């Protein structure tokens, strides 16, 4: 329910920071197509509007767009997952960007600012399933614990402009995301877009499909356009400063084998597919619960995976030249 | 043994931020005293010599410096303890302060740097004593998370300086540290300054000493002579990355009354001590395990602890005019 019974409508501004990206074209869709209401100015950047890590640029994006409200994607991200590790970079410019876009938004004196956490920032060792009160129960994952941290310190400062002056600053914790403008680069990418850029070289080459890996690790997925439409809810009605996990729950927890899977019949694949165990397997689950999410919205209903497998394939196929 | 047998002598600049509090004075008499080597210049700042808030006053003072070593004592601190609480500004403050050292030494080329934590640090529910590997293990207290977040934050910056750079960033982890120049002040103070001046005022009033709480309270204490000596020795021969406690052991805590009974004696007090139960208790215990240090230094021989107070009280006493 992205409606209102309301009669009348304040003027809102909303900054979307990172609103080039997957999850932020994910959001424009949804706003294009009429979940937009009455009063709202929708303002999605890039870095080509500012960099964020730039507190003077920052700080100039906001005085000239004023929001009211701000959905924060931005992340410096890529390229993560790449053989070297360069910790210290990700840990300082993510910190700076969140510092100032968070900062920059408190000073123009807007009313909410939604941030986006993602599941690495979840304890190492941790029981199963992870809720929203395990967040900092333990330390992160080694491997690229400089990202991990940064994004753990979100909600930090979440709290600490609550607290101190009343701010509503809350995030969003997806899972696994996939969908339209997604990054399909292979080496640099995630697996499921990764995955259908495999399938669809494996095609036009005649070769077999490589999966990087055993198959075995457990994900949970979520639709772009699932999660766009989680968002605007979150930023009109959810009023925690904790934050809240956006995902399907514990049992819609697929393998890495079986996306792979619904990728070939999705993409019409009729060649081999092997499993080279030599590349190293990742973490085997990072298993979330969305107990909260179904307090809030019990009857809302995920496109199904294989759907929306479908979807993200044909439009990879039908845009591939513009594609990332 | 902060003397040396070696017979040649490198040039090395020494930074030490705070260098004008409590911590900070020690160091300077230390070194007077002859703890300075050939070849060593050692240059104390304060906020007046540069607010460390402030990136660009921060990167001049460096440039003005050229630091080889820097030990990081500076922190925004005051008024920590008050009623009200400023969890942001503390968060943000530090965390500037942090990043703006860290990384103006890291531009310089400095070869060390040893910043200082505190038990504040640790986890809220943990088990005892507390050891350096325990830091990370579980949110700290809630009552000022945004001040200790930002010292937890030190270790992940060292960490990922020494990864990604190959930086030496490294820090000690004091227990509660007394001594010349410290913060009197009772309201705003810690415990056992504030108890030195409870006793002055008694005396100078006539007044009974009121102990806020039950005198249950147990505290590892630590002379800031004592600290400064082991502070000298880390910033020469302690080349881990993961902190190190700097503290007496867990069978040499005393209570909060037995705190104030050597100061009772120290400053030759005859009237009435009584314990108000109205006022709240703090923690029981923050335990810490000084193991590591024992490793290294199994010798080291700690000022005794009512000479150290004595010595205190006779500052105190000696220069109450000009003291905080
Ligand atoms: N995809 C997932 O699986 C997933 C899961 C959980 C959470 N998240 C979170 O979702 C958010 C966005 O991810 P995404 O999947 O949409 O990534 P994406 O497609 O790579 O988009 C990243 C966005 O960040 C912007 N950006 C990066 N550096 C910037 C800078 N210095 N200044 C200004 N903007 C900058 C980019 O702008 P340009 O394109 O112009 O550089 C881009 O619009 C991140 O916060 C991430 O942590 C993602
Ligand atoms: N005392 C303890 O019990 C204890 C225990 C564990 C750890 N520590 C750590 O020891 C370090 C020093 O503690 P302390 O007890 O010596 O504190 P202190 O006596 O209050 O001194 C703090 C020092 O920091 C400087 N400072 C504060 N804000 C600054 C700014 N914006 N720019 C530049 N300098 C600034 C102060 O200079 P000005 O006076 O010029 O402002 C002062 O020299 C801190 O990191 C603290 O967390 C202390």
Redesign the interface.
Known sequence: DLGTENLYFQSMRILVTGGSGLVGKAIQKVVADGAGLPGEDWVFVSSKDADLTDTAQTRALFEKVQPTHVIHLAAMVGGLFRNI?????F??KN?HMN?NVL?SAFEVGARKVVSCLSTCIFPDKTTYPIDETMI????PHNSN??YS?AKR?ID??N???F???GCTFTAVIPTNVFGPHDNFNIEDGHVLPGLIHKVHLAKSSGSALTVWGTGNPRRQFIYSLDLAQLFIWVLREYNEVEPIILSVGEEDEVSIKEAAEAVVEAMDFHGEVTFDTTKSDGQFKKTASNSKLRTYLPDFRFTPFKQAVKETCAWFTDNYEQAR
């Open positions: 590790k360069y910790n210290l970079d840990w300082r910190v510092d900062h900092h129960n333990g330390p614990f400089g941290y310190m930090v400062q709290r600490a402009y607290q101190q002056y």
